């Protein structure tokens, strides 16, 4: 819901014209199991939801925003660097599961189409290639173990390489 | 199927009677094949091979010399295969 | 040597016999295939599969 | 909707004797018969989603 | 190549559901498309063999 | 290890020296069995028997190390070349892979864009 | 919260009456082990400090829970042994376990390197008394002297190494303070500084070179078989390599290169010997070399993926090899020999213990995801990103990991034991209860391995 | 009829019964644990007004039993 | 012994013959051809010629030695059930059965208790009889049979008694 892209709408409609025989065995069993053990399961689920009555909403999600940039305060200080490194470690854990959503966007395309695979979609294929390539350069990958003090060096190495290429061209 | 003490003696006697080379009237069961019944040195091993094929196929080479009499051979085959309770 | 047919044996092999004969009718027709290979060579390719079993 | 529901049933039916393996309910001599009856209805519950797949 | 006749073959299985084994009219269309396509593929290889023999003479 | 013809019954003679040879082997075999026989057939025991053969068998591998290896000569030195030697062998295998990998990162990229893990 | 109730176990055994003792030591240890899974599990993005630096918080160490799990488990199998001797001898060697647990809690919790050092070597003293005494076979001294002159020979270079860091770069203390640590410039003077930090955790974490410390301690049994599990706790007790390599020398990996290869050959050759070996306790002693060598390889790569498997393997090995030693002990108190060939017979004589023999041997293999598959698989995946040639050697190791445990099975799954007449009672309640308390935690980690494998997971 | 093979059986089967007796003894709050999701509210996701960040439990999700453990 | 070596070779010859032939009538025919080969040299007794014949008997036999021979059903070595369906249980773990479970089937326990009392009492008498045998070393090849008939039990008591049954 909301975040997931998915397909617009599935068609799925049967005509059933060729061969009478016994109408349809797949449709007759589907209608039978809908009343046998599906409607009974729906009745028990509604009875438990109604029995709740009082429900607590609660805070759920915590805020925690900005708290100064890590690549501004330096020169080794315990009072300053500790909270700055906490922000970087929060974002790194968030970025891990951002990739997972984009990963599952490609999973949804493979399940729905199957036969088409690479001929259609294209948008989810392009979205995966753009984020992961940027993720490789900025967050870990070649920067070994997760550390915010070493993360500034990885950004500086990319900045020095880009400046060297721009000067030549 | 289980084997009986009277059944094992009857089964060994039936194979010994159809030997052709040995006389059915001369030897019954109690008589020894080594001295009393007409049997050669090579014939004694050949008679043991035919008896093993009919019953449970188990015959040691070292214990072949100890068994010569048909009464003793019937008892040795029943003891090794565990027969009659 | 005692050899006899048991009621457990009858209600097992007979149930396998239907599966070992009607497998070529149910499985092949139901599953949708892709690209048919049989077209060329009436004796060199098509008959060669059956002729090898005969020879 | 039932395709996803009935697919788990075939997996859950085979794990039910494992649930009864750890004592649960006593079954003398009928324990080999219980496995036979478990797979029998597991076959019927697997035949229905394949019929849906042909469609 | 077969797509014009291949659409009818999928229509038979979608309409029948039970008794899917009894389908011959749509099954013949899949046999008809493959018989013409393989013959055209054999004709292309035969034309290449005929052109190579003619070029060798000159 | 096996020869051209497998040994099972080949090359055996009766003679006189072989006749006394079997008498020697069966004498010790019966001597070591009778001491087992007196210890096996009694209800008052209850316990696992030791036997001097199996204790010395375990002692042959776990112990008797430093009393041995006093004439090293050359056979012991050849074992060290097969010992620490393979470590030197793999030392140039992985090093050539490092020179291949490190050069590709800086110039002419070989690592895929899909890669992100480790 | 953890220290003080653990110290109050010391007057418990001495004040209690002569008939009891063992009942009080086991019951009170189980309720304290419950509170470890109650309070320690709470953490944020970066794990926040506990209190003052007497004992601190856990960042990537749920290995404390394993020590709390073996806190009552070591007292169970030590019931059959020590029972013949005096009451004062019993009270001493129960309190030596409590003293071990006191120092072991202090090692994992306290986020330090200076005070951590005087707890790392401090665990060697109680084990020395336990190993040298109560030895069933001889050559106790050829394992007791070996226990110190291998560890202290490698760990005393930490005094010249750790103090050298704090005298130049601020102070070691919290490690959470340690952002002051600057990358090494790679000089010949800094070569032996790195080696001194490593060598302490190159002996307890067994390689192929200087590995002989381990099998000598296991073969010569301390008490029965449950004090052997304390030596397993010392393999995982050398977890400082997770802390030194990550913080003190992150740029240094050029000197790690030969030490990966030294541990890589401690996989093929350590598994080859463990095939023709006669002693049953030795077969677990050499299998413990290979499993801990996998951690050694993983740490020196320094990839974020390797630590996920390395930390998992510390918990995986600590509950599986200890399970295997309990099976060796269950035959040691019935047959009275460590010989594999002499003690042969399961199901025919040992009916229900044979299923425990299966589950313990199958965990050495790659079972459906318990912890051993999870722990090993990340290391194999990390080695391929390190160097592609590795799995050609690592795959051969996977063949002999079957031979590590199936050879243990085959030489026990035979209907013989003609020479043997003893071992009438297969398991006297607690004998199988030991085996269940080792496997059921691994079965609970199938559902939640997030609690086990957690260095920023 | 035969005397058959011999196993301890008595020591073996008693262990499984003694094990199950203590699993079922603490299997009662497991049965109550299912009804706690049924009777009491499970989870709700909503944007909170600026007043308090933590009350009893700081962050409660999925199960109500998470909040009960967060207090102690 | 020379006579035993011929008997062992002849026993192996017939049992290895069934691997080559399919039908029983051909097996009976080829057995008669083998008997004619042995009987020609059986009449003549020599210390040099017969020993050379036995050494040459291994030849030709070794040329057709491995066609995967029929190793019988319940037989030592070979293939197909050598120890399978014969695991059973030894008599050493019989007394291990605790009360409540031992109360079930009281006839099996009462008869075994009477047999165990007979074996324990005769163990002292058999120990003196075993050392009564003249050897003055330890033993020679096989165990000696008892001369006394009043006391019974010829040294070993649990040798023939207590065995595996399918």
UniProtKB/Swiss-Prot annotation, chain A:
It is found in: Mitochondrion inner membrane. Coiled coil: none annotated. It comes from the Eukaryota. Accessory subunit that is involved in the functional assembly of the mitochondrial respiratory chain complex I. Complex I has an NADH dehydrogenase activity with ubiquinone as an immediate electron acceptor and mediates the transfer of electrons from NADH to the respiratory chain. Belongs to the complex I NDUFB10 subunit family. Complex I is composed of 45 different subunits. Interacts with CHCHD4. This is NADH dehydrogenase [ubiquinone] 1 beta subcomplex subunit 10. It comes from Bos taurus (Bovine). The lineage of its organism: Eukaryota, Metazoa, Chordata, Craniata, Vertebrata.
Curated annotation (Swiss-Prot), chain D:
Signal peptide: none annotated. The chain crosses the membrane at residues 3-23, 42-55. Coiled coil: none annotated. It comes from the Eukaryota. It is found in: Mitochondrion inner membrane. Core subunit of the mitochondrial membrane respiratory chain NADH dehydrogenase (Complex I) which catalyzes electron transfer from NADH through the respiratory chain, using ubiquinone as an electron acceptor. Essential for the catalytic activity and assembly of complex I. Belongs to the complex I subunit 5 family. Core subunit of respiratory chain NADH dehydrogenase (Complex I) which is composed of 45 different subunits. This is NADH-ubiquinone oxidoreductase chain 5. It comes from Bos taurus (Bovine). The chain holds residues 2 to 56 of 606 of the full protein.
Curated annotation (Swiss-Prot), chain E:
A motif (Cx9C motif 2) lies at residues 23-33. GO terms for molecular function: NADH dehydrogenase (ubiquinone) activity. One of its GO terms (cellular component) is mitochondrion. Complex I is composed of 45 different subunits. Accessory subunit of the mitochondrial membrane respiratory chain NADH dehydrogenase (Complex I), that is believed not to be involved in catalysis. Complex I functions in the transfer of electrons from NADH to the respiratory chain. The immediate electron acceptor for the enzyme is believed to be ubiquinone. Belongs to the complex I NDUFB7 subunit family. This is NADH dehydrogenase [ubiquinone] 1 beta subcomplex subunit 7. It comes from Bos taurus. The gene is NDUFB7. The chain holds residues 58 to 115 of 137 of the full protein.
UniProtKB/Swiss-Prot annotation, chain F:
Belongs to the complex I NDUFB4 subunit family. Accessory subunit of the mitochondrial membrane respiratory chain NADH dehydrogenase (Complex I), that is believed not to be involved in catalysis. Complex I functions in the transfer of electrons from NADH to the respiratory chain. The immediate electron acceptor for the enzyme is believed to be ubiquinone. It is found in: Mitochondrion inner membrane. Its main location: mitochondrion. The keyword Calcium does not apply. The chain crosses the membrane at residues 75-94. It is a single-pass membrane protein. The gene is NDUFB4. Complex I is composed of 45 different subunits. This is NADH dehydrogenase [ubiquinone] 1 beta subcomplex subunit 4. It comes from the Eukaryota. GO terms for cellular component: mitochondrial inner membrane; mitochondrion; respiratory chain complex I. Keywords: Acetylation, Electron transport, Membrane, Mitochondrion, Mitochondrion inner membrane, Phosphoprotein, Respiratory chain, Transmembrane, Transmembrane helix, Transport.
């Amino acid at each position: 819901x909301x975040x997931x892209x998915x397909x617009x709408x599935x068609x799925x409609x049967x005509x059933x014209x060729x061969x009478x025989x016994x109408x349809x065995x797949x449709x007759x069993x589907x209608x039978x199991x809908x009343x046998x053990x599906x409607x009974x399961x729906x009745x028990x689920x509604x009875x438990x939801x109604x029995x709740x009555x009082x429900x607590x909403x609660x805070x759920x999600x915590x805020x925690x925003x900005x708290x100064x940039x890590x690549x501004x305060c330096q020169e080794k200080d315990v009072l300053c660097m500790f909270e700055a490194e906490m922000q970087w470690r929060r974002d790194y854990k968030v970025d891990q599961e951002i990739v997972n959503i984009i990963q599952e966007r490609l999973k949804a395309c493979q399940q729905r189409e199957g036969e088409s695979h690479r001929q259609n979609c294209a948008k989810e294929l392009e979205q995966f290639t753009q984020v992961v390539k940027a993720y490789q350069d900025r967050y870990x990958x070649x920067x070994x173990x997760x550390x915010x003090x070493x993360x500034x060096x990885x950004x500086x190495x990319x900045x020095x390489x880009x400046x060297x290429x721009x000067x030549x061209x | 199927p289980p084997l009986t003490l009277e059944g094992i003696k009857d089964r060994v006697l039936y194979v010994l009677k159809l030997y052709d080379k040995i006389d059915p009237e001369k030897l019954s069961v109690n008589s020894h094949f080594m001295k009393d019944l007409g049997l050669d040195s090579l014939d004694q091993v050949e008679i043991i091979m035919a008896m093993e094929d009919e019953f449970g196929f188990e015959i040691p080479d070292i214990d072949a010399e100890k068994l010569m009499c048909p009464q003793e051979i019937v008892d040795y085959i029943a003891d090794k295969k565990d027969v009659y309770e | 040597n005692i050899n006899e047919n048991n009621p457990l044996l009858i209600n097992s092999i007979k149930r396998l016999l239907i599966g070992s004969l009607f497998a070529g009718y149910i499985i092949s027709n139901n599953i949708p295939p892709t690209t048919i290979p049989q077209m060329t060579m009436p004796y060199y390719l098509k008959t060669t599969a059956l002729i090898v079993t005969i020879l | 909707n039932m395709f996803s529901s009935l697919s788990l049933v075939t997996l859950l039916l085979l794990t039910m004797p494992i649930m009864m393996m750890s004592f649960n309910t006593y079954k003398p001599s009928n324990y080999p018969l219980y496995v036979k009856t478990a797979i029998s209805y597991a076959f019927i519950t697997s035949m229905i989603p394949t019929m849906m797949f042909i469609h | 190549y077969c797509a014009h006749y291949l659409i009818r073959f999928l229509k038979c299985k979608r309409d029948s559901f039970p008794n899917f084994l009894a389908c011959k009219h749509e099954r013949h269309d899949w046999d008809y498309c493959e018989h013409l396509d393989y013959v055209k593929r054999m004709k292309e290889f035969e034309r290449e063999r005929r052109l190579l023999q003619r070029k060798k003479r000159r | 290890x096996x020869x051209x013809x497998x040994x099972x019954x080949x090359x055996x003679x009766x003679x006189x020296x072989x006749x006394x040879x079997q008498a020697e082997r069966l004498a010790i075999r019966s001597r070591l069995k009778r001491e087992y026989q007196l210890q096996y057939y009694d209800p008052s025991r209850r316990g696992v028997i030791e036997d001097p053969a199996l204790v010395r068998w375990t002692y042959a591998r776990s112990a008797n190390i430093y009393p041995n290896f006093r004439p090293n000569t050359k056979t012991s030195l050849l074992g060290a070349l097969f010992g620490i030697g393979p470590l030197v062998f793999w030392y140039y295998v992985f090093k050539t892979d490092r020179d291949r990998k490190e050069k590709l990162i800086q110039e002419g990229k070989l690592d895929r864009t899909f890669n992100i893990s480790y | 919260k953890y220290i003080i109730p653990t110290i109050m176990l010391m007057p418990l055994t001495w004040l209690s009456k002569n008939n009891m003792i063992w009942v009080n030591s086991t019951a009170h240890s189980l309720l304290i082990s419950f509170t470890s899974l109650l309070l320690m599990n709470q953490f944020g993005d970066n794990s926040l400090n506990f209190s003052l630096l007497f004992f601190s918080d856990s960042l990537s160490t749920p290995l404390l829970i394993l020590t709390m799990w073996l806190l009552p488990l070591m007292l169970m199998a030590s019931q059959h042994h020590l029972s013949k001797e005096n009451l004062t001898r019993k009270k001493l060697f129960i309190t030596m376990l409590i003293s071990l647990q006191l120092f072991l809690i202090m090692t994992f919790t306290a986020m330090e390197l200076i005070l951590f050092y005087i707890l790392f070597e401090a665990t060697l003293v109680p084990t020395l008394i336990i190993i040298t005494r109560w030895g069933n076979q001889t050559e106790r001294l050829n394992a007791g002297l070996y226990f110190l002159f291998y560890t202290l020979a490698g760990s005393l270079p930490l005094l010249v190494a750790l103090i050298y860091i704090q005298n130049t770069v601020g102070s070691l203390n919290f490690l959470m303070l340690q952002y002051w640590v600057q990358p090494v410039h790679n000089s010949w003077s800094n070569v032996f500084m790195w080696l001194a930090c490593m060598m302490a955790f190159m002996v307890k974490m067994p390689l192929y070179g200087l590995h002989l410390w381990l099998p000598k301690a296991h073969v010569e049994a301390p008490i029965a078989g449950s004090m052997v599990l304390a030596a397993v706790l010392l393999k995982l007790g050398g977890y400082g390599m997770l802390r030194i390599t990550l913080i003190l020398n992150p740029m240094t990996d050029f000197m790690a290169y030969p030490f990966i290869m030294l541990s890589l050959w401690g996989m093929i050759m350590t598994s080859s010997i463990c095939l023709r070996q006669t002693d049953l306790k030795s077969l677990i002693a050499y299998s413990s070399v290979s499993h801990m060598a996998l951690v050694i390889v993983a740490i020196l790569i320094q990839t974020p993926w390797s630590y996920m498997g390395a930390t998992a393997l510390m918990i995986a090995h600590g509950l599986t090899s200890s399970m295997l030693f309990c099976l060796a002990n269950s035959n040691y108190e019935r047959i009275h020999s460590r010989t594999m060939i002499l003690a042969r017979g399961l199901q025919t004589l040992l009916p229900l213990m044979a299923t425990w023999w299966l589950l313990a041997s199958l965990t050495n293999l790659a079972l459906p995801p318990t912890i051993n598959l999870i722990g090993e698989l990340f290391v194999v995946m990390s080695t391929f990103s390190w160097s592609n040639i590795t799995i050609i050697l690592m795959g051969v190791n996977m063949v002999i990991t079957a031979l590590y445990s199936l050879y243990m099975l085959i030489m026990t799954q035979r209907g013989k034991y003609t020479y043997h007449i003893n071992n009438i009672s297969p398991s006297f309640t607690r004998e199988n209860a030991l085996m269940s308390l080792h496997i059921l935690p691994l079965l609970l980690l199938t559902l939640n391995p997030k609690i086990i494998l957690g260095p920023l997971y | 009829r035969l005397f058959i093979i011999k196993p301890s059986g008595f020591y073996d089967k008693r262990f499984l019964k003694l094990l199950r007796f203590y699993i079922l003894l603490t299997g009662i709050p497991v049965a109550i644990g299912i009804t706690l999701i049924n009777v009491x509210x499970x989870x709700x996701x909503x944007x909170x007004x600026x007043x308090x960040x933590x009350x009893x439990x700081x962050x409660x999700x999925x199960x109500x039993x998470x909040x009960x453990x967060x207090x102690x | 012994t020379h006579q035993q070596k011929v008997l062992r070779l002849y026993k192996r010859a017939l049992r290895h013959l069934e691997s080559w032939c399919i039908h029983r009538d051909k097996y009976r025919y080829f057995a008669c051809l083998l008997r004619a080969r042995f009987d020609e040299h059986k009449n003549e007794k020599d210390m040099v010629k017969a020993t050379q014949l036995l050494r040459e008997a291994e030849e030709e036999f070794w040329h057709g030695q491995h066609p995967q021979p029929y190793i019988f059903p319940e037989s030592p070595g070979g293939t197909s059930y050598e120890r399978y369906e014969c695991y059973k249980v030894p008599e050493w773990c019989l007394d291990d059965w605790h009360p409540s479970e031992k109360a079930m089937y009281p006839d099996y326990f009462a008869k075994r208790e009477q047999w165990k009392k007979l074996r324990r009492e005769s163990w002292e008498r058999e120990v003196x009889x075993x050392x009564x045998x003249x050897x003055x070393x330890x033993x020679x090849x096989x165990x000696x049979x008892x001369x006394x008939x009043x006391x019974x039990x010829x040294x070993x008591x649990x040798x023939x008694x207590x065995x595996x049954x399918x």
